[PDB]
Design a protein around this ligand. Structure first.
Ligand SMILES: [Cu+]
Ligand SMILES: [Cu+]
Ligand SMILES: [Zn+2]
Ligand SMILES: [Zn+2]
Lengths: 151, 151
């Protein structure tokens, strides 16, 4: 099974470590993000593992299939669309999801790409804003990291 | 041609950005590293893109072929063995090399792995120390980054 990891940092107090592994036919994503305002924050794979300009140089959502932005359960979603993480009142969000479009091998591998956690909630394409079908209108980028191979 | 990038940071003042691209049958590695003591500093691809424990969690040199540590021109070298960068008197080293064992695709891809710049010179396996044929006796890790996909 391939294993990957991602250490998130950015222009905010938000930190955390995300683990990714192949498990059966999906990828299991786990970890904790801290320093968040309570509530939902968008969380996606972005196309580029490029930290030359903070989290901005990560580019847009990873979208090898040319779909609109959606919810993780949708067919019409970016490969990178992992929805929201939910921070508790203490500012900490925990992840434990299984995804069928995130890959750690093959043409749609996310190795060397970026995870981003956002300022605002991801509206899952349904918020009625110009950015809804692009980004989920999730606003700016609190923290990000390049997805790397681990043991 | 695949393009990658790596932003180096660590427990030191050393920073820099490294670009990697496929060019003909090799990979071209370019960039500048700053904040170094003048002279030679070891520079390698390490196996893991894992920043959970600073540069230590990058593991050892990337060595998919089970070779000893050597010089870049050698057959008996780790795939990750890029020799030394040379910092000038102003503490800045510039890279411009072409390598045949670094890959950005296939089984030996370095996407999602780490570049490390070291405290000491890499002795290229020839220094006569116990670590020479392991690490080049290059000492600790000044800065590192995960190798990511870019445009
Ligand atoms: Cu995002
Ligand atoms: Cu090294
Ligand atoms: Zn999206
Ligand atoms: Zn080596």
């Amino acid at each position: 099974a391939i294993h990957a990891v991602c250490v998130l940092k950015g222009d905010s107090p938000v930190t955390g470590t995300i683990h990714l592994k192949e498990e059966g036919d999906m990828v299991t994503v786990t970890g904790e993000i801290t320093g968040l305002t309570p509530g939902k924050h968008g969380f996606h794979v972005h196309e580029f593992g490029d930290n030359t300009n903070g989290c901005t140089s990560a580019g847009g959502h990873f979208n090898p299939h040319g779909k609109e932005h959606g919810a993780p359960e949708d067919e019409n979603r970016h490969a990178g669309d992992l929805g929201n993480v939910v921070a508790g009142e203490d500012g900490k969000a925990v992840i434990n999801m299984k995804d069928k479009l995130v890959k750690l091998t093959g043409p749609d591998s996310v190795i060397g790409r970026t995870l981003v956690v956002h300022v605002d909630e991801d509206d899952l394409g349904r918020g009625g804003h110009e950015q809804s079908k692009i980004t989920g209108n999730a606003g700016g980028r609190l923290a990000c990291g390049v997805i790397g191979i681990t043991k």
